[PDB]
Amino acid sequence: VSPIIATILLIAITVVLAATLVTILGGFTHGVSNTVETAGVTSHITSKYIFINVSSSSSAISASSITI
Amino acid sequence: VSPIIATILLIAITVVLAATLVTILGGFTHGVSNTVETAGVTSHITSKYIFINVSSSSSAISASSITI
Ligand SMILES: *[C@@H]1O[C@H](CO)[C@H](O)[C@H](O[C@@H]2O[C@H](CO)[C@@H](O[C@@H]3O[C@H](CS(=O)(=O)O)[C@H](O)[C@H](O[C@H]4O[C@H](CO[C@H]5O[C@H](CO)[C@@H](O)[C@H](O)[C@@H]5O)[C@@H](O)[C@H](O[C@H]5O[C@H](CO)[C@@H](O)[C@H](O)[C@@H]5O)[C@@H]4O)[C@H]3O[C@@H]3O[C@H]([C@H](O)CO)[C@H](O)[C@H](O)[C@H]3O)[C@H](O)[C@H]2O)[C@H]1O
């Protein structure tokens, strides 16, 4: 009798460890993305205005997505 | 007499536990397979057509097996 019952208990424990491990991995598998951008930019500054002129960029992006 | 009869009953019980355990294991030993695929794909979109051009793939697969 007892060696089979001990085996059933060890299967029950194994499932909870595997379920625990899955929640540990979730802290690694997020928030990685390609954020690199590169632009040819020239600028001139005066007592009233900053002028900014763009010559090229790595990608086309919205002017609302850029913070100054 | 009675210690031998008690032993015969415990053998009968043991077989039913082993048969029970075998049906528990069957829930683990299925549905695991190598499903990973990886392709070099490029695409262009227009008001009438999507164009899709493939440069390489990890394996050769039927175009009917892919869902869009
Ligand atoms: C990005 O890409 C763009 C597009 O290609 C440009 O190439 C940019 O390069 C910059 O461009 C700006 C704008 O052209 C340049 O700013 C000028 O800088 C010159 C100096 S410079 O040595 O001549 O080269 C001038 O300062 C010029 O100003 C003009 O306007 C002045 C103000 O006149 C305004 O207001 C009056 C009312 O008071 C209006 O009647 C008039 O219509 C106008 O709206 C004038 O005083 C000035 O006269 C004298 O200026 C200088 C001395 O400061 C002198 O050296 C000159 O010979 C001249 O005698 C001149 O007529 C600048 O132009 C901008 O004008 C705006 C104005 O709102 C009109 O848009 C601002 O008010 C400023 O005056 C000024 O920013 C800059 O130098 C370039 O780098 C690329 O970076």
Ligand SMILES: *[C@@H]1O[C@H](CO)[C@H](O)[C@H](O[C@@H]2O[C@H](CO)[C@@H](O[C@@H]3O[C@H](CS(=O)(=O)O)[C@H](O)[C@H](O[C@H]4O[C@H](CO[C@H]5O[C@H](CO)[C@@H](O)[C@H](O)[C@@H]5O)[C@@H](O)[C@H](O[C@H]5O[C@H](CO)[C@@H](O)[C@H](O)[C@@H]5O)[C@@H]4O)[C@H]3O[C@@H]3O[C@H]([C@H](O)CO)[C@H](O)[C@H](O)[C@H]3O)[C@H](O)[C@H]2O)[C@H]1O
């Ligand atoms: C999962 O997988 C999916 C599918 O692949 C996506 O990839 C998803 O990624 C997310 O997608 C959503 C939806 O595309 C993104 O939410 C958008 O976020 C952008 C910000 S961003 O910087 O431009 O990238 C915008 O906020 C955008 O909102 C649009 O709609 C706004 C509201 O317009 C709605 O209502 C008006 C009436 O008032 C209608 O006329 C119109 O048709 C529409 O229904 C606009 O204001 C907005 O304009 C400006 O928005 C931002 C500032 O907020 C600015 O930066 C922009 O440049 C632009 O000038 C823009 O047009 C979001 O889209 C969703 O739109 C719904 C709307 O119901 C339509 O479905 C909501 O109302 C919200 O507006 C918004 O959720 C999200 O960023 C992605 O992560 C993957 O995760």
Ligand SMILES: *[C@@H]1O[C@H](CO)[C@H](O)[C@H](O[C@@H]2O[C@H](CO)[C@@H](O[C@@H]3O[C@H](CS(=O)(=O)O)[C@H](O)[C@H](O[C@H]4O[C@H](CO[C@H]5O[C@H](CO)[C@@H](O)[C@H](O)[C@@H]5O)[C@@H](O)[C@H](O[C@H]5O[C@H](CO)[C@@H](O)[C@H](O)[C@@H]5O)[C@@H]4O)[C@H]3O[C@@H]3O[C@H]([C@H](O)CO)[C@H](O)[C@H](O)[C@H]3O)[C@H](O)[C@H]2O)[C@H]1O
């Ligand atoms: C156990 O171990 C064995 C041995 O190793 C296997 O590995 C087994 O795995 C299963 O194997 C079976 C048999 O190979 C697989 O069933 C096939 O499934 C595919 C789908 S798949 O995405 O391509 O992978 C197909 O459905 C295939 O069917 C073929 O046959 C169809 C019917 O053709 C029959 O009838 C015509 C007359 O109408 C005859 O001319 C012809 O000779 C043949 O007898 C075709 O329609 C089918 O074409 C298209 O099928 C699919 C769409 O359904 C599409 O995706 C394909 O790209 C293709 O364009 C294809 O040619 C299945 O094979 C079995 O064929 C028998 C037939 O009797 C011949 O034996 C049946 O009639 C069924 O058609 C089908 O069961 C199964 O997927 C595997 O899991 C291990 O489990």
